[PDB]
Design a protein around this nucleic acid. Structure first.
Length: 113
RNA sequence: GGACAUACCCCAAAUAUUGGGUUUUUUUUUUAGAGAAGAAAAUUAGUGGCGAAACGUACGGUUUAUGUCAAAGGAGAAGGUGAUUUUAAUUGCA
């Protein structure tokens, strides 16, 4: 219906045509953006609090990969946090080890792979 | 000289507007999305007293009679008498 809509500019957008751009972005924000700010949060969610160090967890690096593959389908600013979360939880990793935390060493899976 | 640590200090970022990092001085506590605000506990009665009988009677136990069922023995195990003769005391039977 946006292909059929009044693209032949009315004055209501001729005022708004000094800051923003296409109406496809001005509508999809309203109905699609509420769900991607939920998806991003849900990926930070399961990575942030549930999987720190956690010896028992390959699924961490699964979610991480599947959320990196999510980035180049949709919005991009949820990736700067992605890289910096992976790093900050690596700085959480390599210091103390007082749990069932990852022995970052010769153990090929938990460290290298 | 003023302010500044969750930095008010740096980095970053456009459909992005909030993610990250860093300085000393003392103790301080063993983590950090929780525990509190339920899930079952105390209960006593206005619980009369005393108390039989006719009747009816179970599985049994011991003892006495009874049939039957194993192995045994035909010197046996030993019961029946006027079938016989003379005899004083003992044991006496063939």
């Amino acid at each position: 219906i946006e292909d059929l809509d009044n693209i032949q500019t009315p004055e209501s957008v001729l005022l708004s045509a000094v800051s923003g751009e296409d109406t496809q972005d001005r509508t999809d924000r309203l109905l699609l953006t509420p769900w991607v700010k939920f998806l991003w949060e849900s990926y930070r969610q399961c990575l942030d609090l549930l999987r720190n160090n956690s010896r028992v967890e390959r699924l961490y690096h699964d979610i991480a990969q599947q959320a990196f593959k999510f980035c180049l389908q949709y919005t991009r600013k949820a990736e700067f946090r992605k890289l910096c979360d992976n790093l900050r939880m690596h700085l959480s990793q390599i210091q103390r080890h007082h749990n069932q935390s990852t022995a970052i060493n010769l153990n090929n899976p938990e460290s290298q792979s």
